[model samples]
Target: EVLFQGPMEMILEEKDASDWIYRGEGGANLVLAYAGSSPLFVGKVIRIQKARRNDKAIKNSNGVVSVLTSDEQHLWRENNELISSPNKEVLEQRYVQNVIIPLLGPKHVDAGVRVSVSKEFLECVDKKVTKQRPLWRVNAANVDTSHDSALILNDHSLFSQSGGDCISVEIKPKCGFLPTSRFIGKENMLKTSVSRFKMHQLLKLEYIEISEESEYDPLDLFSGSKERVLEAIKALYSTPQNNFRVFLNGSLILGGSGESTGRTSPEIGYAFEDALKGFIQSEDGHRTECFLQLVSDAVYGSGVLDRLLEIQKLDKLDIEGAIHCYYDIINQPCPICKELSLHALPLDESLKIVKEYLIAATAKDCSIMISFQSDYVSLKPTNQTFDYKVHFIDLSLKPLKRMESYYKLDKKIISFYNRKQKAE
Candidate 1:
């Protein structure tokens, strides 16, 4: 293994594209991991933008794609650099570096390096990973060959430099606290009682996105109790949806890859159980239990989620209340009020509300990756030990235009939850 470190800004040529294997992708970007022996890029991954098959670009009259509208420009006025960003990639870099890093703390968050990528390189990458990508993903979009840059981040899947079996748990623990905002309609009172994650599961099940609802509860995970946190980890392990993923030495051992999979059947459970063999030194039935115990122990001891929940609660006024401020920023009539029944203070104050709300949205959507290194943090039950590191991933910016959809989804989730409650 080579060892070196050098420049920040480097161009990735077409030849460099071969080194990256398809890690996974979200709706907006494709993630590729490095397997090549380049010391500089050893434990790194490149985030490349994806282009929809039939894209309806947000463009101005001159065919210039509006990265941010004038209203958005005014909304994010204080971050002058972010507003003036040439494209989405730079926009993402600035948003994370400037906005998120400050709020989330730079210790666990990595804004990553922006490396130049020629068009030829992106085109080659797009075709090379075609078969490896999910069918639904391939049908929806391909790599955005138009992008001039890609983000280079440390592969959070692996933990140590001396690397033996670096076990990691990648959990997307969604909003923990239920909203008590006055903006919630009286009919949607269930929003205060039920967490958004719990409510959204019914909708996903209805949409056939999942085979069944996950037993995991965000409130239990964030409750800060060893028992409760352990319960959360067990539930997560049971279903292992898009929410929970375990990677051993950079390969996924549990949970779905790319898409949210159905509930864990005995077969998948047994397979995952087999993978944990040497790593977990417990009886056959209980190794999975102890593995969950290990993760629960890591999360409870870390206290990282507590800080994340605090940030997520920055949505003081839920989208129900914030949409009014959004309309004010856009200098438009409060369509919801006019259409339904009411409400921004001024340009500056409205921007503050929406800006922070979006920031909170980013926090709500992000995932926490906990990895065990060579050193140790002991677990009482099994007398096992692990030295862990916690890092946040998928800290992408929430588009300002998503404000309307935010309100729509919030309403949908609550109403469906309420309807189900009433029916039962």
Candidate 2:
């Protein structure tokens, strides 16, 4: 039920791969390479020219690697959901894979969607868009174009796998009406280049990229119990640093917190609730409780700490050296033409700089929270009172006897990668 709002000219690209397959019933079996050149066209909505049916099917339940089957063609149509046509996600996936992926093929769904924009919405978007910087920043920020241009939408849940648990939607039409290539097949179609580097980076990763490999499905992920849902959330909360996106019915909820992760704020929660509209039926108190529990589990369960364990196990560099390197990387100058200085900065300044830097780096559209202690850092979704901490210790230079002190005695099990190196 995630809804796409305005800033609408974005197109849909199905997968990170260049190839596409159509598993729909009674409409059109389509596949193609993405070769368009506009970002404004990405999410622009286009009615299926001659839609004949209201169903399609996805076979298998192995995450997103699942395939599609027709309800009419299958015996299990009674139990299958994929065959249902007019499904925004299924159609969009097909459209992107068939219309956009191959020509401009990249391994990222973000890029594929960009290609979709070029193919479908560029012509209908506003002329003034040519004056803006590009679609990535503008689109992600929910920037407004003219009355008619590309629309942008994204929603993410802190622990919800359906990034669509929270939703953002945009509506836009490409500017200038001309010959229709998709419908009537016209030549001289203009190829627009509205590339954004960060968006392109999103295209590279399999997880973030729109592809046949998408593991997120909000409805399916939270299908069962409160406890299962809570557990899923706990798993996510444990490792908040990595970008964990959610999707409700195939729409991006909120963009991730980049290198930061955790519980979500009221602002984000409201947005997600708005998107869910009917499915999520819980009072604010209960929802908040569940979300907080998820975050607490992530923190206390050593999910975050488990990740840090890798640094301690490094072979070429000791834990101390690895941390130094990490700090060095974080303290380096901003890579995206941003104006920030972290080198030799104080601890507080350094953290602030890095926070801003990661937001910019991830093109985060939502607010985020991050914290550090001695050798521990706890990042949770930002709330009205966001409080967490991390501690980056230099263990390489310390004596072996002192090593035990750095880690809490409670941690009996450690990363094999780290343990193996230490044993050696």
Candidate 3:
């Protein structure tokens, strides 16, 4: 029999529930890592859907709504198949496959294969994982038992089935460049100078989402220079803040498990340093420094973030400017102003600008996972290297309806930041 490049995914049943364990979760979905000895799923992770406790309460209309809003359909009018998907699962898979994979390149992108899951399987998983989930998370959302399929992805934390001593670093690098759009108001011109990550840092402090300001800079990571990239890695290690995470053999070691922990302290530093003794050939005092350099080398050597920057730059107009284009898309009067200087675009141009902006938003929120099998090169304290693979994970689709909320949120962030800075 001739073999094919891709194999048909097997269905997951209730009996299979015992073979997987809780890995971690984001707001929308939960991930499970295979713990059983089955070769078929040896190096895989399953992403299952989650439904909020008050999910139905959020629905205002008594009538049913299409998964894609009518305007959203027009927005992605080019992708007929994607707009026609019957369910959210198919829509998501098609979005990644048809839209993102082509732009991001298939080398580091994995759309993941879909595996049919029984309701019994989904129900069992929800109960099994509840106790392990954070109380706050459990209160907000639970596994979506209604879903009949879950995504089976290659375990990005490990290289292969037998991959040993594997270490992975997950980085959520936000937008890198400052906007230079002319449509930005003269008073709000600060958007051209300050990066969004920097502005949001001050606001998060006010909101108490983080304990301290992160030293990390997205521009440094995307600089394509060895020196700046190394600087960015060092900054991230200093203030991890959910933007940075370290995994040893698929279990988190350095960063917070499910929350954001800012500023690596002496205790955290010591633990992280100790974990690097096997990977970096350095004295205890210098291991942390060297390990960060290795991470930088892996990033710089692979040159993965470069392509990501291109996608992010597709937001030619900052949200401040793009919000007008969004108004045009929905055929609504621009609240920013009925016909501002920003609203000069033709209909097709407005659609293109807003569409690209959402794609850029996805790039901004996406995270990258860099996995290293083991130390391969010389491990000097100051200079070191490692064999690595970089994969972009969690390229979730953004709903077309977020434009209004996104504008309001940005207004809140910049307003609070501006007020506090002026007060100081």
Per-model TM-score versus the true fold: 0.93, 0.22, 0.92
- How do the residues 346-396 of candidate 3 rate in per-residue lDDT, one tens digit apiece? 899989998898899889888899888652433455554566888888888
By summed lDDT, the worst window of 10 consecutive residues in model 1 runs over 338-347
Name every residue pair that clashes in candidate 3.
none
> What's the TM for model 1?
0.93
lDDT of candidate 1 at residue 415, scale 0 to 100: 80
Worst 10 residues of 2 by lDDT: 169-178
Per-residue lDDT over 60-167 for candidate 1, one digit per residue giving the tens place of the 0 to 100 score: 768887788777787777888999998888888898889888877888998888889999999999989998887988999999887798899999888855546888
| lDDT score at residue 23, model 2, on the 0-100 scale | 11
Q: Rank the candidates by TM-score, best first.
A: 1, 3, 2
CA-only RMSD, every prediction = 3.1, 24.9, 3.2
Error of 1 at 306 (Å): 1.2
Off-target runs (Cα >4 Å) in candidate 1 are 1-9, 60-62, 339-344, 374-376
Q: Which is the winner by lDDT between candidate 2 and candidate 3?
A: 3
Q: Name the top lDDT candidate.
A: 1
**Cα-based lDDT at residue 116, candidate 3:** 91
Q: How big is the positional error of residue 293 in model 3, measured in Å on the Cα after superposition?
A: 0.8
